[PDB]
């Protein structure tokens, strides 16, 4: 065998849990440990699952809702935390059921309107910014600051920001950002010594899990190796160094307002 | 809604197809038009078929002939091309039956031997040069010179050289080629106003060949839109005219000795 096929350990999913583990502990560093009544989250797809299990050990109750039924699936089946659709959610709000003292918004593009969050009255309120590079188009659909604006000096306000340094994606989006940080490790195993080409094993993940709600083969997709690589030498070090590299590009942080 | 999902109208099998007839136009330039009684191509992955029909019309027969068996599948039973595999092909010799005036070898790294090749007596013999950007261990792996060693001044000799314009490949494969066309494709595409992500549709496809024999599977995972794209705009038009552009980077020609 002069020609070899080395797959990555790493595989999708690592890369969109390193993420969201950056994008928690931005959030970790700016709550400082604060402890809450009652937590609301909208959002889980992609990172908003993991935010409600790690929020719960500070917080006596967490809400996680979207506005997709479907979506509880990501959702494990006991903890502090409870998963409602977004029509479940306002209706007990309606009966002041809810009143939660931090709200975290996740839902990015076309998300949630801020008229509706201007109804709840938290003690702290993040948002994530769902922008990265500067487009017109981009920056024109967000309406992030019109999210905060009701909080602003009556709560602790936080806008989340993730980027990569010196690189380009146009999302602060966690699959969009792991898309762009496999398909640049891609091309710098490509250069090393004995390889001739290197695929990222990416596939149209929205159109399975937003137009057939079949989470279970979202879930295998996304277990599989990041890159395959087609090679002369034994890569496989330097390739998971070069994943690891791009990974470390990435940079989160929350804004104060 | 705000986003949009668009699938390019080329497909992979589309890109594949285009460098395929830039290879082989830099060969009919390079034959110009020279008629043979017996030619013989040594390698169906990935544009062997193709040269085999394309010749047959210069040719009176015409071989195609591969190590592996299952790359018969590759040729169509519509066509005048003769499939043997190389112990066949190998048999033929012993007993007389072949002596190809044209030999053509699109094998590459690790493919046939200069021994074997040196028992022929072409008027042409045509080898494809594999490399791309230097690379010490492909370069070493390389023995195309020693292919054509046989042949200099005794036939009228040609070696094909592939490459893309200011950008970086590591060999001159056709697939390789498409591979990376397609993923700096999907990166300029991503670049334009309103793009949130574009993915590059690529699978493992010599896993899918040489390790399944699926040839029906290869097929219709290279008929499947060269990229997908996530965006707020509609931008077919200017992602087909992207893609055509880095299409065109691609440049081959013939080298005569
Ligand atoms: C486009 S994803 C955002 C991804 C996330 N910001 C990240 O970086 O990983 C939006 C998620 O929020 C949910 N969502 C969209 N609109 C919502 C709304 N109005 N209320 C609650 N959830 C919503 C969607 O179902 C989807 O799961
Ligand atoms: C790596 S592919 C070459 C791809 C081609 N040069 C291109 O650019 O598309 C090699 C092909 O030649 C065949 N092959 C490899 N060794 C061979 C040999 N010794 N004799 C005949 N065919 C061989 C393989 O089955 C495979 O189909």
Redesign the interface.
């Known amino acids: 065998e002069?020609?070899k096929?080395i797959d990555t350990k790493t595989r999708v999913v690592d890369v969109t849990n390193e993420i969201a583990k950056k994008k928690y502990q931005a959030i970790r560093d700016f709550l400082e440990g604060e402890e809450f009544k009652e937590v609301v989250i909208f959002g889980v797809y992609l990172w908003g699952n993991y935010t409600a299990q790690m929020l719960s050990k500070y917080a006596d109750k967490v809400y996680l809702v979207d506005i997709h039924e479907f979506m509880k699936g990501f959702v494990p089946n006991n903890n502090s935390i409870k998963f409602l659709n977004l029509n479940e959610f306002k209706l007990k709000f309606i009966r002041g059921e809810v009143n939660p003292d931090l709200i975290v918004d996740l839902t990015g593009?076309?998300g949630i309107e801020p008229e509706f969050l201007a109804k709840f009255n938290p003690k702290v309120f993040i948002v994530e910014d769902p922008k990265g590079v500067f487009?017109?188009?981009?920056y024109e659909?967000d309406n992030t600051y019109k999210r905060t604006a009701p909080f602003i000096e009556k709560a602790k306000v936080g806008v989340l920001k993730t980027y990569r340094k010196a690189r380009?994606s146009?999302?602060s989006?966690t699959?969009?950002l792991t898309?762009?940080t496999i398909?640049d490790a891609?091309?710098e195993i490509?250069?090393l010594?004995?390889?001739?080409?290197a695929?990222?094993?990416?596939?149209?993940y929205?159109?399975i899990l937003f137009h057939e709600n079949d989470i279970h083969k979202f879930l295998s997709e996304i277990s599989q190796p990041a890159i395959?690589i087609?090679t002369?030498?034994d890569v496989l070090d330097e390739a998971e160094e070069i994943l690891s590299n791009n990974i470390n590009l990435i940079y989160s942080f929350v804004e104060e307002l």
Chains 1, 2 share one sequence.
């Not at 487009?135 to 981009?138: P, T």
């Not at 695929?199 to 149209?204: A, C």
């Open positions: 002069m020609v096929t593009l076309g487009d017109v188009d981009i659909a380009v146009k999302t989006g699959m969009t898309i762009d398909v891609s091309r490509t250069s010594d004995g390889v001739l080409y695929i990222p094993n990416l596939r149209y929205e159109g395959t087609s002369l030498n």
